[PDB]
Amino acid sequence: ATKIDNLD
Amino acid sequence: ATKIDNLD
Amino acid sequence: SPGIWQLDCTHLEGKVILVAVHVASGYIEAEVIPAETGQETAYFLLKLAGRWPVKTVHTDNGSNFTSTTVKAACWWAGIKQEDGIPYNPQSQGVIESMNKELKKIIGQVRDQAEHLKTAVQMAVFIHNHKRKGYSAGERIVDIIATDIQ
Amino acid sequence: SPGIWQLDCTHLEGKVILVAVHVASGYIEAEVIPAETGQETAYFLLKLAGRWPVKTVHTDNGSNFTSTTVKAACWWAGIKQEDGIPYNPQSQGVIESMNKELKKIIGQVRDQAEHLKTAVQMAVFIHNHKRKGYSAGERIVDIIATDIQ
Ligand SMILES: [Cl-]
Ligand SMILES: [Cl-]
């Protein structure tokens, strides 16, 4: 998801 | 429940 | 004063951020919970006291002061549970200013994290490493080490 | 010395207990998670690094070493992520013996807690306060304070 805690 | 984390 | 901590409860995005401040250093630990309940508070305190030598906690409000679950955790962990009446009016201002600082940091990181819990841990990290110069994380370790010696 | 930590993952009651050990002191932090994933590991390390000055983490297995999510947290928090190969074969027996100590404590407190997570935090507390005479919690503060000075 493009987030540090959700790279997807 | 007589537990520290559930006194019930 | 090396073992004195203050609880603090603030809200963001419809959730509750519970904070423990080490009064003499300004170092903090925090967590995000759906609601502040005696059970969540008690668990947070059990965690804090297994990590630092917590002698006294000033509770953040009367419901956590009253809560038998919270007192049961303070008993278990060897903590003296106290009220958080700001006999020194400077206390109110310091906590209010910390909450504003934390929320500001959370807004600065908020888009790097999907979950608020991540952003709050990033804010704890930046708060504790900030040099004002020593950091809060340096000050707490210096204060307790001095006390142990 | 002062900045080196080792992850360790052990199982109980169909759940996973993830542990970080501060190698020079034996002090620990731990949490219960339903399963070890790179996301849970990464969040745990972000929490640890906001609380102590984590320079290096030796990961507990090759999946956490490989995990881009874990590497992204180690990048964020300024942590050097390393493998946990026991080049000193003593490391391997020290971890096994800690896991057995922790599980023993957990069984000793297990009936005071409804939830495994409480029992694990009670075990962290007893582990870190135990004098073997200094405790692990006194040793980690002394080691880091000594390094800051
Ligand atoms: Cl609430
Ligand atoms: Cl697993």
What CATH number is given to the structural domain containing C13?
3.30.420.10
- Lookup: tokens for C46: 């059990």
Structural domains in chain C (count): 1
Contact call for A and D: 3+ CB–CB distances under 8 Å: yes
DSSP-derived 3-state class of residue D51: helix
- State whether C112 and A1 contact (CB < 8 Å): no
Structure determined via: X-ray
Contacts of B4 in chain C (CB under 8 A): 42, 69, 72-73, 76
**Which tokens belong to C44?**
């947070």
CA distance D103 to chain C (A): 16
For residue C136 the two structure tokens come to 């809060």
- CA torsion through residues D81, D82, D84, D88, sign: negative
Sign of CA dihedral D92, D117, C2, D51: positive
* Alpha-carbon dihedral angle through residues C50, C54, C55, C56, given to the nearest 10 degrees: -120
Report d(CA D17, CA D32) in Å as an integer.
Answer: 5
d(CA D93, CA D38): 25
Any alpha helices (H) in C4-149, and if so which ranges?
Answer: 38-51, 62-66, 68-76, 90-109, 116-129, 136-148
Tell me the one-letter amino acid at D109: V
Asked whether D142 and D28 are in contact (CB, 8 A), the reply is no
Contact predicate D45/D54, CB 8 Å:
yes
Cα D95 to the center of its chain, rounded Å: 10
Look at residues D115, D138, D114, D125 and name the one whose alpha carbon lies nearest to residue C79. D125
Q: In what order do the strands lie in the sheet with D27-33?
A: D27-33, D15-22, D4-12, D56-58, D80-82
From residue C41, alpha-carbon distances to C35, C68, C86, D111 in Å are: 10, 11, 20, 21
The alpha carbon dihedral of C73, D109, D116, D50 has a sign of positive
Cα dihedral value C101, D54, D30, B4, nearest 10: -40
CA separation for the pair C147, C85 (Å, rounded): 26
Q: How far is CA C57 from CA C7, C91, C131, in A?
A: 7, 14, 25
Element (DSSP H or E) covering residue D49: helix D38-51
CB C59 within 8 A of CB C81: yes
Domain that holds residue C101: 1-149
Token look-up 């908020």 returns: C110
Question: In Å, what resolution does this model reach?
Answer: 1.9
Whether residue A2 lies within 8 A of chain C, CB to CB, comes out as no
Radius of gyration of chain B (CA): 4
